[PDB]
């Protein structure tokens, strides 16, 4: 997270950390709890090549990484069939937990938006995670969960932004209809925030607008962060997640 504070303890109960085996169960990607047994995350964290489930664990909302690890196992991974790279699109994936989670005041699911929501510019949206804090800098070793409030851009304005200073012809669409844009030179997600939720407070309710996907570096001029547009994939999600 570029910019922003440490998060208040109560504030983001659906945030998940994904761990990979090694000398220790290292954090590598974020996610969100959308149902007591399902986690929503970015496909490029787990694909396109298949992974052994021996190597993966899920951690719920701790405040500081690694201090209180109670690693949950994963029963299955599902990746959108259209995925191959993040710039092509369909960067979305599902994890099914072996054991369901006791929902609690401290651990609660995020709400998915109705398919009619567009999230026009000006909305109040936040992104959260344990990713890097400046363009090359690891989060320092207390490892707090950070948060930042980002601006939203309309897609066609975002596509124009990406064409500045590039050789790509202006006929060629860079930012696609299954994507969403947010952030600016002061406020962005970064490495290791991938797969984390972007949420917006619509009508008093927190809805997940998107998933941290890709960008041309962190906080760079005329390069907003690109997010997977969750409403675009609702029919694919509800084929598996028991609504």
């Amino acid at each position: 997270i570029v910019g922003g504070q440490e998060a208040p303890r109560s504030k983001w109960p659906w945030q998940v950390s994904l761990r990979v085996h090694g000398p220790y169960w290292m954090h590598f990607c974020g996610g969100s709890l959308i149902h007591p047994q399902w986690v929503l995350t970015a496909a490029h964290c787990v694909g396109p090549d298949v992974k052994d489930l021996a190597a993966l664990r899920v951690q719920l909302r701790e405040q500081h990484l690694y201090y209180q690890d109670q690693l949950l196992p994963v029963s299955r991974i599902i990746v959108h069939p259209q995925f191959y790279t993040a710039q092509i699109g369909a960067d979305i994936a599902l994890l099914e937990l072996e054991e369901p989670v006791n929902v609690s005041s401290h651990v609660h699911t995020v709400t998915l938006p109705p398919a009619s929501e567009t999230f026009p510019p000006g909305m109040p949206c936040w992104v959260t995670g344990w990713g890097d804090v400046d363009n090359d800098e690891r989060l320092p070793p207390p490892f707090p969960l950070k948060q930042v409030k980002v601006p939203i851009m309309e897609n066609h304005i975002c596509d124009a932004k990406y064409h500045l200073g590039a050789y790509t012809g202006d006929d060629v669409r860079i930012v696609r209809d299954d994507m969403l844009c947010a952030g600016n030179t002061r406020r962005d997600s970064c490495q290791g925030d991938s797969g984390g939720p972007l949420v917006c407070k619509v009508n008093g309710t927190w809805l997940q607008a998107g998933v941290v996907s890709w960008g041309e570096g962190c906080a760079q001029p005329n390069r907003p962060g690109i997010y997977t547009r969750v409403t675009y994939y609702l029919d694919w999600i509800h084929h598996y997640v028991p609504k």
Partner: antibody, heavy 121, light 109 residues
Framework: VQLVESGPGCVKPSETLSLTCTVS????????ITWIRQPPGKGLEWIGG???????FYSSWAKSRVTISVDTSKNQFSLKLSSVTAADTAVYYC????????????????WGQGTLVTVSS | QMTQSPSSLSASVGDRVTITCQSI???????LGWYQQKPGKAPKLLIY???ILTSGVPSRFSGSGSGTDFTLTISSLQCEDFATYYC???????????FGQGTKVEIKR
């Protein structure tokens, strides 16, 4: 990297049997352990186990009498079986599931050596 | 709950053998494996997730199965392949999982 069981070898009827498994290297933070029993000449039967999330699962008959527990301060897993009878004489094993599932038998990759327990007067 | 067959067999060195395991239902998610128990020591995992060969196992061993019926097959027997074999599988999460009764393989010589 290996497990070791421990136990009394001999117990009389109506005591409570205790067993203990210890992680010889690293810490099995993230991993799971199941307990397997083998009466002489018979095949294997599953007692129970504990998941990476610390959830315990017990076989049909084991719920009446078994408790499984973990203590990171000793890097150990422990089994207790109440009210033993002569028919409990078997080899006992602890084994690890690398996925961390508390109730699975298809991928027990790493095993202890096992210890006999004989129930006799 | 499962049955495994044959309960016993005898076969020469250089022969080929196959063993079956069956069930009333299907395995929740390719969760079936095969174990080799040498006499006097702990069982060893050989095959997991229906057909993945465990590392370091000589690729003499093979297996596959249709969710309800499963097979284990040798390339050809050696003397040290002597063991009892068990299938094991799981039919849900948290519940119905079991070993089979086991098959004991003995060598003509």
């Amino acid at each position: 990297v290996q497990l070791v069981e421990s136990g009394p070898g001999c117990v009389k009827p109506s005591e409570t049997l205790s067993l203990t498994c210890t992680v010889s290297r690293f810490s099995l933070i993230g991993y799971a352990i199941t307990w397997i029993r083998q009466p002489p000449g018979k095949g294997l039967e599953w007692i129970g186990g504990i998941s990476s999330a610390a959830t315990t699962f017990y076989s049909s008959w084991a719920k009446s009498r078994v408790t499984i527990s973990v203590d990171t301060s000793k890097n150990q897993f422990s089994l207790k079986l109440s009210s033993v009878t002569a028919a409990d004489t078997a080899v006992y094993y602890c084994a690890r599931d690398p996925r961390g599932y508390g109730a699975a038998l298809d991928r027990l990759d790493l095993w202890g050596q096992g210890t006999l327990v004989t129930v006799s007067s | 709950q499962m049955t495994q067959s044959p309960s016993s067999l005898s076969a020469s060195v250089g022969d080929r053998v196959t063993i079956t395991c069956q069930s009333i239902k299907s395995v929740y998610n390719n969760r079936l494996g095969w174990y080799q128990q040498k006499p006097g020591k702990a069982p060893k995992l050989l095959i997991y997730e229906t057909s993945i060969l465990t590392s370091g196992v000589p690729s003499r061993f093979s297996g596959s199965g249709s969710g309800t019926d499963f097979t284990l097959t040798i390339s050809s027997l050696q003397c040290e392949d002597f063991a009892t074999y068990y299938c094991a599988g799981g039919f849900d999460r948290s519940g119905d999982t079991t070993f089979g009764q086991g098959t004991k393989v003995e060598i003509k010589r």
